[PDB]
Every structure is written in C-alpha cells, then in structure tokens.
Amino acid sequence: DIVMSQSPSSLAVSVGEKVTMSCKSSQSLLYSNNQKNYLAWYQQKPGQSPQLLIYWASTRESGVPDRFTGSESGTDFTLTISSVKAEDLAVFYCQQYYNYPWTFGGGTKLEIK
Amino acid sequence: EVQLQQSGPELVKPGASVKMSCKASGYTFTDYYMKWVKQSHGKSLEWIGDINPYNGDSFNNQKFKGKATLTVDTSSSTAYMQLNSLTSEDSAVYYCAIPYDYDEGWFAYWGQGTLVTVSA
Amino acid sequence: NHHSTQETAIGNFFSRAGLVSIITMPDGYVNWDIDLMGYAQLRRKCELFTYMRFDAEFTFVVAKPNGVLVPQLLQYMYVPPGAPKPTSRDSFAWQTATNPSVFVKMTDPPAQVSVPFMSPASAYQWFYDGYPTFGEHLQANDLDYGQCPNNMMGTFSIRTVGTEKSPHSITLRVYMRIKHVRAWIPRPLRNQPYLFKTNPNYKGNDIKCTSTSRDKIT
Amino acid sequence: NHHSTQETAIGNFFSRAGLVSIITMPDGYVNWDIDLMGYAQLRRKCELFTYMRFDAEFTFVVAKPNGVLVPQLLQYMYVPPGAPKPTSRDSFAWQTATNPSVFVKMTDPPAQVSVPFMSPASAYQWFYDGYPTFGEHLQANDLDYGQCPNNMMGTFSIRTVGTEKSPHSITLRVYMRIKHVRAWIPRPLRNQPYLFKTNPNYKGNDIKCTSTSRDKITTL
Amino acid sequence: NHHSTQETAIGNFFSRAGLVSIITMPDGYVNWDIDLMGYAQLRRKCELFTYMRFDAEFTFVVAKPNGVLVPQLLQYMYVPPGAPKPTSRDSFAWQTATNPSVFVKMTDPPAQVSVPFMSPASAYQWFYDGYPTFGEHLQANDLDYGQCPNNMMGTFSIRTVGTEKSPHSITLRVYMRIKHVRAWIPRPLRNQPYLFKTNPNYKGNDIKCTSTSRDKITTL
Amino acid sequence: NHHSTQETAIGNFFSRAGLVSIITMPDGYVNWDIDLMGYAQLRRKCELFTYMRFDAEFTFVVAKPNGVLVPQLLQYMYVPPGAPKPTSRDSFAWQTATNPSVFVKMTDPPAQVSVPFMSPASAYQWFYDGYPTFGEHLQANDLDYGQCPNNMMGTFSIRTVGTEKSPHSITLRVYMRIKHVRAWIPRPLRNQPYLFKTNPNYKGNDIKCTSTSRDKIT
Amino acid sequence: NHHSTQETAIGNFFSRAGLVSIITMPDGYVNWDIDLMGYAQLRRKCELFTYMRFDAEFTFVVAKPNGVLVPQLLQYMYVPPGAPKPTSRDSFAWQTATNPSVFVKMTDPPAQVSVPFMSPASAYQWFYDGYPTFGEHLQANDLDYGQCPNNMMGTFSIRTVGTEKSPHSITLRVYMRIKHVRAWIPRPLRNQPYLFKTNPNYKGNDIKCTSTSRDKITTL
Ligand SMILES: CCCCCCCCCCCCC/C=C/[C@H](O)[C@H](N)CO
Ligand SMILES: CCCCCCCCCCCCC/C=C/[C@H](O)[C@H](N)CO
Ligand SMILES: CCCCCCCCCCCCC/C=C/[C@H](O)[C@H](N)CO
Ligand SMILES: CCCCCCCCCCCCC/C=C/[C@H](O)[C@H](N)CO
Ligand SMILES: CCCCCCCCCCCCC/C=C/[C@H](O)[C@H](N)CO
C-alpha cells in the first residue's frame, strides 16, 4: 500500500573503508519517522539506531556500534557507516511506522553487502 | 542486557489457531513495548503491530497473521500473537523485539524467531 | 519590629498545588474513584485541622510514561454520586448532557477548573468517629468505620475520544490548590508513616519515635 | 433558611453542552441533514416541555477515529433549506458567497459559533399532532405524521478543503449549548427507550415499568 | 408588526467572504493578474448594480492540493500597475521597499489585510459601454471593448521564500469581504451561465429560459 | 478640490519594511558586519536626502534555504563597536551580560525589536566628502575616502544555541522600517546601477542614459 | 548641553539577562546546587559593589545538545535549604505540596518566574571576611573561609516528568535579570581571570598586567 525503497542493490565491497546508504521514505505523515535495523545472517538482531528524518537523528547505540550515523536534506534520507571487516557483512534496512515512534509495519526493503 | 529467548519454533494445523510465546530474559515484565515480526521467504519483512494489544497498524491484522493479537499471559510474560493459522500461507518466521531501557522503546535484543510451519 | 505575619496565615499556607493522584492507562478508559488522601505530603497538611471548608483549583497534567507529548485528544468527565458510570470507550454516558466535561489535547497547556465546595454538611471532615449506617455491627462489617458519606464526591473518569483504540499510553497527574479556606479544631500531627487511604492504622512493629535519639543526657 | 433556588432555574438547567451528532467520513464530503433528536440524554431533557425558544452555541470537536490529530484543513458550511447542496468534493456550492462557513484545521482548538433562533413560528416544537400538507391521507403517506416543516433547518455539510483526495479519516462531534431559553407547557417524561428520530414509537413487547418492582407490600 | 428590515440592507447583503481566485503552484512563483470576476456566485451578486464603491477584507487560505499543511514559508506581494514585476524565484523585486507584502507560514492561521478603495474614478464599474483608447477600430482590435482602465488594479504575485526550490505544492484560495459599500443603478440579473471573465457573451445555442416550463396553462 | 497630501509626506514614504541583508550559514555562527546599503531598492530611497535621523524597527525572518521550517533554537546578539566579538559557537561573549540579545525558535513568528537613533552626530549621513583620520594620504590609503566613523554601528552576530553542531542550514532575512524620520538637503537621484557598498563608483563603459531614446524629434 | 544621564544609572546597568548556569542531563534528574558566580561576564559586573539588594527574573531556555526541540515534558522545582531533596526520577519530593514548581514542555516558549529578595540579612554580599562557625580553625577546615551562610539559597532540581526513562538529552540554560537594585560600597574591578566559584584566588605564575605595555615612554 504505502511503501519505500532503499535502492543500493548490492554494496559489493572489497574489504575496505567507506560505504553509504539511502532509505527514501514516502509516507503519508511527514514529521515523526525513525529507521534502521541490522539483520545478521547467523544469529540474533541488533538494531534500534534511529535517524529522525526531519530533526534529531540517533537516539544511538551507546554501546555496540556507535559508528552508525545520521542524515539531512528535509526529504527523507539515511546515511553512512564505517570500515567494518569480514564480520558484520550483514543486510541492513530501514523500518517505518504508523502513528508514532514505536516500531510498526513499513520496513520493507533490504540491501546486501 | 542479557538475551531474550523464544520458545521452540514448531508447527501447527491449517485451522488450529495456536498461540506462541517468547519467554522473557528475566529483568522486567510488561513495562516494555512488544513488537512482532513476520517475513515471507523472499526476504520481504513486513512488520506486525505493537505494544500489548496495540497491534492494529496500517492495513494488516488481516491474513490471520496477527489475528487475535492478544495481550500478555504473565506466565512467560511476553506471550501474545494468537492467530487463526490459515491453510498454507503463514509459513514464516516470527520475531519478538522488546526494549530493555538504554535501548529505549525500539529494539533491545531479539529472539532467534519461531518458524510457523503450515504445510498440510 | 516590623516583622510581617502575612505569609504565615491559613490562606497562604494552603495555596500551593500538591499532587493528589496519578491515573494510568497502560480499553482506553478508567473510572478513578475519588480519594484525595493517597499522597503523604498534602495529606499531612490537610489532617492538621479536623474540619475544613474550601474551594479548589484542579489541574490535569497529562503525558506519556516518559514525558513525551504526542497529539492525542482526551476527555475528562466529573461523575457525581448517582450518575450513570461509563462502561466502555464509547458508552451512552459520554454524551455529557448533564455532567461537566473538559476536552483538551495532550499537546495543549494543562487544563484548569475551579470546583466549588460541594458537600452536604457545613465543612469537610477528615475524621469521623462513628459508623454511617444503623443496624448490627459484627466483625465482617468493619470496612465502614470512619467512612463518612458526605465526603464521597463521586468518581472522575477519563478516556480517549475516538471510537477506535488509540496506540498511546496515558499517565494523568492531578494537582489541587486550595482557595478561600476556613479551618477548625487543630489536631496533633502525624509521625508514623501512612499505610492506607481510609484509616489511620500504622505499622505496630516499627514505632518511629519523633525525636532522633542521642547517647547521653549531659 | 437561606437555600438558594438560583441553580435550579430554567436557564441553568439547559446550559450544558450535550452531544447531538457524530459525523463520520470513512469522496471526502458528507451532507448531514439536521436532526438534533438522535441522542437520548439531551432528547429526554428537551422533550420535557412542549414549546421551546432559544439561541444556541455549537461546538465542533474533530479528530481521527482513535483520537489522533493530524494537520488537515476542513470546511463546514451551513446550508439553509432551499440553497443548492454540494454534490462533489469541489462543487460550485463551496464558494460560499451567501452561506456562512468555518475554515479550521484539525490541530486547532475546536470551533464555536452562535446561531440565533431561526424558526418561522414563535418557538420550536418537539410535538406536532397533525399532517403538514393537505390532500388524501392513505396508508402509504404516513411518514409525515408529526413532521412539522418549521423545524427542518436545512442541512450541514463538511468537506476536506483540497481538490485532491485526503488520506485521513474524519469523525466530527457536535455539541450544543442552550442560551436565553424560554419554555412552555411541561409534559410527562419518557420511560421507554428511544427507537427512531421522528416519532415516539416504542417496543411493544418490552413494557419497561417505571418503578423497580419488589416482592411484597409490607416489606421493602 | 415589528418585522425588522435591518438584515436586508445593502451592507449586510455584501459582507460575506466569497471565493475569488484559486492560485496553484504545481519555478515556485506565480504572477496572478487580478480579475475578481472569475467565480459565478460572487459575480452574480456584484453585477446586480452598475457602480459600486467599497473597501475590502482579503483572506488567503493556503494549503497543499489535498488539504495537508506542512511548514513552509511564503510571501505575498501586491504589485500596483507600473511597478516592476518579479521574474524569478529571487528577483530584485522581492525586496519590497515600496510594495506591501505579507510573510506567513502555511501552518499559521490564514492572513488578513484590509485594502482601501483605490480606483481613480468615483466608484468601480462592472459595465463599460465604450473603448478605452482613441484611433481606428477595425476587426482585430475588439479585445478591449468593455475594458475600462480604472479597474485593473495591477497584479498579485506569491512565491516560496528561499533561494532554493521547495518540494511542496501550493494552492492558494483568496476570499473577499465587502465593507462600507455604496451602490448605484441596479440592473437586471443574469440567467445564462458565464463563459469568460471580460465580456457578457453567452452560449447562443442554449437559451436557458428563466422559468421552468410546465405542460398546460390551466393546470400546474 | 479636496485632494489629501497626507500619504505623500516624509513619514509615510519611509515607513515600509525593506530588505537590508541576507545572512547565510551553509561552525554554526557568523559575524555579519553592519552595512545597510547592500540592496538597491532601499538604498535608492535613503540616498535621496543627505542627512537623515530616525529610529527603526528590525524584523528577522529566518528559514532554511528552501523555505522549510524546522524547530531549531537560535540567538541573535547586537555587538556595539568595542565589545568583544564571538570567536566560536560557544565563546565567552555569548553570555550577554551587557549586550542585548534575542532568543527565538525558527518555528515562532519572526522577532521584532525597536532600535533607537544611536549615532554620535546629530544625524546619519550617506555622503562624507573627506577622510576620517589625519596624516599622509598616499595611493595605498584610499579605502577610507568617504568612510565616516559615526555610521559604523558595530556588528550583529547570530548562532545556533547548543554546544554541539546542528545539522540544519540557516538563511536569515532582515527587514527595517523607519519611524520618526527627519531629513535634510535632498540630492539628485541615482540612475547608474550600484557596484559596491562603500562608494558611488559606476561602470564607466556603460553610461545608462536616463531617458529611453527615440528615433526623431518631430 | 542636554546629554541625559538616564541610561547610565544603576537600574539600567543591571537589567540585562546574563547567563548563570548550564545544566546538562547526558537517571533523568539533576540536583543543581545554586551558585550564580560561575560565569565571568555577569560575575565581573555584580562584584563591582560589595552589598547588593534586588529581585530577579529567571528564564529557563531548554533544548537538546544541538538546538533541536522535541516534545518532552519537564518539571523544575526550587528547593529551599532544609527541604527534602529528590533522590530518584520519581521520589516523594516531586509532589510539590510546599515547594514552587514549573511544568513546561520543551516546545513551548521559555518559562519565566520572578523571585523576590529572600536573604535573612539586609542585602546579599559577594565578599565575607570571616568564618561562618566558631571553634578551632586548623589547616583542614579552610574550605569555609569566605562562605557566608545567608547566600546559600538551597538547590534547584529538574527532571523529566514520566516514571519511565526518556530517550532525550537535556541542556538547560538559565538567564537572570535584576530588577529594583540597590547597591553599596563599590570595589576595584577584577583584572586576573577567574579560577573557582567560591574564592578570589588567581594564577600566581601569570600576573596579567592591566595596561597593554609599549616599547618606550616618549613614543606612543
Ligand atoms: C472536571 C472536574 C474534575 C475534578 C472534579 C473534582 C471535584 C471534587 C473535589 C472534592 C474536594 C474534596 C472533597 C473531599 C476530599 C477527600 O477526597 C474525601 N475526604 C475522601 O475521603
Ligand atoms: C456553521 C454553523 C453550523 C451549525 C448550524 C446549525 C444551525 C441550526 C440549529 C437548529 C436549532 C434547533 C432547530 C430544531 C431542532 C431539531 O433538529 C428539530 N426539531 C428537528 O426535528
Ligand atoms: C497584500 C494584498 C494583496 C491583495 C491586493 C488586492 C487589492 C486590489 C483589490 C481590488 C478591488 C476590486 C477592484 C476591481 C475588481 C475587478 O477585479 C475589476 N473590475 C476587474 O475587471
Ligand atoms: C538585536 C538587535 C539587532 C539589530 C541591531 C541594529 C542596530 C543598528 C541600526 C543602525 C541604523 C542605521 C545606521 C547606519 C546605516 C548604515 O549601515 C551606515 N551608513 C553604514 O554606512
Ligand atoms: C522555580 C524557580 C527556580 C529558580 C530559583 C532561584 C531563586 C534563588 C535566587 C537567588 C538570588 C541570588 C542569591 C545569591 C547569589 C549567589 O548565588 C550567592 N552569593 C552564592 O554565593
């Protein structure tokens, strides 16, 4: 019904330093949103790292990775991370929600490193 | 801090309407905000609604995935997501994601997820 | 001297808004029975005198369980004793053709009303040596000892406005000022901590002495 | 004694805002006819007297179906009997060069207007023993028994403002106060529950007695 | 009798805010000329009299194409006839050291101004039997028949404030009240529908009769 | 006749808010030097007369580069000539125990102040035939020709309030009204376009004639 | 001459709101002791005179560490010396049946109060040559030299309102105006920079001379 598409298809990195993201929401209401899960293949799921599209990003993880970052531009976007090695080659994706800041339906599309 | 566990991922009959539980880590009960997940096998992950029965998100609550989104039972203390379990569609895995304070509201720690086998 | 005794009078002592209730909504409605003796700081002040007669200024500060404010329409309704109580999120009693009601969003400044002195007697009383009814007084009837009927001011019920179910959690905090106060017959103040709302019973195994004791006398 | 009889007068009894309508938008416009006898608490009060003459204070509290408030521009328009009704979300009748109209967002405090007494007779009447028209009165014409024409105050139509289609759902709640009230000829109050809006018909298989019955006559 | 004739006077008949323009921004600026005869309900009222003299109260209700309100800073600017028009989103004419201007967000309540009677003649006129200029009047010059120069009040240009390009769509709705009105020489009212803004031309193949015709003369 | 000459007087001609500056923040602070002769429409009006004496009403309209408004707390500070300038986002000069300051949110209506006539002379002057200092006047010193010292009103510095770095971009627009105006010695108006802020120099290769020329004389 | 000396008086010199504290919340509550001599610009002004007597206007500007504003309910509470301090996010001292308190959102305009002159002496004093208590004065007791007890105005504690833990960070900025000021006994101003809050001690290895020195005496 009401979707969004993060559109890097494959990050395809040779083991290095720099990489970026973009989620691009298209929701009905446009003041509240926060995003970004983790989804490791092997085992359980970190996440929780919120970028408010309009104002303050991150109510970040003060522990685990703090190398997750925030975004800008008024239009809805989320952005880069750091230089991780062969562990944490995972499949990252945004989440999206109905009314207000808890995790709801709308975290549709993924991306593979 | 410590790991949220699930129950054993197991199976159901195409008309049985059987619950699921996701037994707590041990710190707190019912103050956190429960979230239930359903993914279909092409890595499409569509989220099912919130807190205690506060589960009726944007059109959903409907294919009997999330049907009877229930409240807690306080025995395993993170148990709801009762459904109808229709014939041969609800093949998925189901994560519960509750917060533990410092991971405010959103996602503290998950389970490994319960596969629901509708295969009859 | 010219030391003024203005700000030690009875009216200036009571005109401070103290907390009286915390109402939580973890069906989207509550029926909070009225009892304004559930919080110890205002209760120790009001139980200095036996009889008190006053008006009040109630103030309803409403937020989520962690202080966040989201746009959510609410409705408070004061229910007098005898009126039909609400039973669901949308009963017939929410039409409010007789009862007063306040409609205020959570994002607005907190609402204020000014209730009058509405007791059938001449003044409120926090102490009542007697039983309200007649008849036999056996062992199983001792809930109503010290329960005067002219203090029960009915209930106070809040809800979320819509006919669906809202996804937010509500904690209401009510504060009460006291205006135009007249008091009578001062009493000894309380030293033991409080245990219930309706009776002065105390922990009999922990007699807290008033004065912090010392070692010697000289 | 010095017991006051001020707050038992006729004016103080009716000046309380009671619910009169719930208007829902599940094309983004409705044409709600006017009938203020659809909710039982205000209806039992107003049908104590036969004739009543008053002004009013209407109040429109608008939200989503679960009390959430989103920024959405609305427009209410009072349509007198005879004026052209709106037909779509953007008809020609929304220009409002003659009809009064209120433009208010959903995020604002609720709007208030003060309508006057606008009936052709001397007072409103909730009871009318008679037919409005002349002619034959056969069986198929008995919708209009007890329908006086000088109470139909036209309709009241709301919409969302834009020419596109808004994605939000609207439930309006209207409350009416009564000011400067004069009444006449008090009637016996109602005990049976209400069934329709236009007639006093009751459930004939369930005669609810007024007094809750007891067992004997010599004991309570 | 004591029937009042207060609310049928000339001042009470015109003091209702009617729609006069819809300004849409699907470069982020428009230069809307000012023609207040483009909407049929206010136009049929104002063309009852020949000459009219009044002040006005303009009101600008601004939203997205579906009634949603987002925080966006706007700027309206009234341009008198002769002033330099704006050409881009940030021209030199947006400095407004001479022209009046309103800065208002989309989230605020709608803005209101009170323009005075600014015509060089004694009153406005909606009818002008004549040509504004001298000279030859051949076939190709008949755009200006019935175009009086003392009604063109310049233009009215809006924009989004920033020097970048905003991602939102704007639909402005302007409403005009009429205060301190004096009229002269009433005319027959219009029955055919309107076709253009500058001339009374009508559809010659569809003569809409005024009265809805019936079948006979001895029965209704 | 009864033609009124009220709205052609000197006070009604100048009391219109014209743009005087655009301040952009693409460290989250700027130190905008004061010069109100950088925009041509108000400058052509104010340079009609030689000397002018007035108060003013400044208005600060602040938004993002595309008109969007996000909540963001700002702070403006008027710095008189001689006061310590701010150097960083959080210097010691932002305490403002002496300088006036405005704290306003980007979401609020735009702020307004009313500055008085603060010049050491009797009136401002837009023309000054002379040098401000004494001494030798060789070729390399000709920046200060026509620079009177009693027009420099210090600077005007804005910032974002927090000690971290805000992620938003700021464009401020300042508008100035003129109240209680008295003028002296009218001058010929300008026809060539403007090139700088501090001198009347013009493009010598493009002499724009005043009247649009025609073909013949008859 | 007609040079006025109005805006150089004592009242006009002090009536400017200067920063006095920055309160940060990186359990969601703080107990900020009161000391208004921690910021050098207002401290150099107030230590011109020995004794000062005034009222004040406090102003609390609250935001997140980067100026962003989010809807979050707060509560400030002034705690007099002797009152029970709060210990947790929800202690028993937050009921405020005796202490004054302000409830304000972060999205609102900043709150303002007007405290009176609340000292037991006739005026405040920023200098106190003496010890507050009696008894022996050995080496380990020299924290209280120059600590008068009639300047400690208790503490000032803020919190987030809810019983859970809020996910936002709070930085409060407090500004203080001075109204109805009377001063006594002016002192020499300070030239060395400030080092602590409770004593005039200075860096003994860096004697900053007042005048910027030059090279010779016969040439400026
Ligand atoms: C819309 C208004 C909602 C608030 C309605 C409150 C009105 C009732 C105020 C009652 C004033 C005190 C009455 C007695 C106080 C104690 O609760 C009783 N002693 C209970 O024992
Ligand atoms: C912008 C204003 C919108 C609201 C317009 C409402 C004005 C009409 C008020 C009517 C007052 C009562 C008239 C009669 C009441 C009952 O509906 C009739 N008896 C119907 O049977
Ligand atoms: C900031 C103010 C913006 C609005 C400016 C509007 C002022 C002009 C009002 C004009 C009043 C009516 C003048 C004539 C009306 C018709 O348009 C003409 N007859 C055109 O034919
Ligand atoms: C918080 C207040 C911020 C705004 C402070 C502005 C006050 C200064 C106003 C100056 C009035 C005009 C002074 C001279 C104007 C021209 O800039 C000079 N001639 C420069 O050459
Ligand atoms: C809700 C109100 C919160 C603010 C309460 C502040 C009231 C206290 C104001 C104190 C006025 C100055 C008192 C003395 C100033 C210096 O801090 C002392 N000299 C400390 O050495």
CSV table of C-alpha atoms in Angstrom, one decimal, chain D residues 92, chain E residues 44 189-195 202-213:
chain,number,residue,atom,x,y,z
D,92,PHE,CA,-19.8,25.2,-7.2
E,44,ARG,CA,-23.8,37.4,-10.0
E,189,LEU,CA,-29.8,39.9,-13.0
E,190,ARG,CA,-28.1,37.2,-15.1
E,191,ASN,CA,-29.8,34.0,-16.2
E,192,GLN,CA,-27.5,32.5,-18.8
E,193,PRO,CA,-24.3,30.9,-17.4
E,194,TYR,CA,-20.9,32.6,-17.5
E,195,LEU,CA,-18.3,31.8,-20.2
E,202,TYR,CA,-23.3,33.6,-23.7
E,203,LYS,CA,-23.9,30.3,-25.4
E,204,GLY,CA,-26.2,31.1,-28.3
E,205,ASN,CA,-27.3,27.6,-29.0
E,206,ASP,CA,-28.6,27.0,-25.4
E,207,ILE,CA,-31.1,29.8,-24.4
E,208,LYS,CA,-31.8,28.8,-20.9
E,209,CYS,CA,-35.3,30.1,-20.1
E,210,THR,CA,-35.8,31.6,-16.7
E,211,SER,CA,-38.9,29.8,-15.6
E,212,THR,CA,-39.1,26.0,-15.6
E,213,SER,CA,-41.8,25.3,-18.1
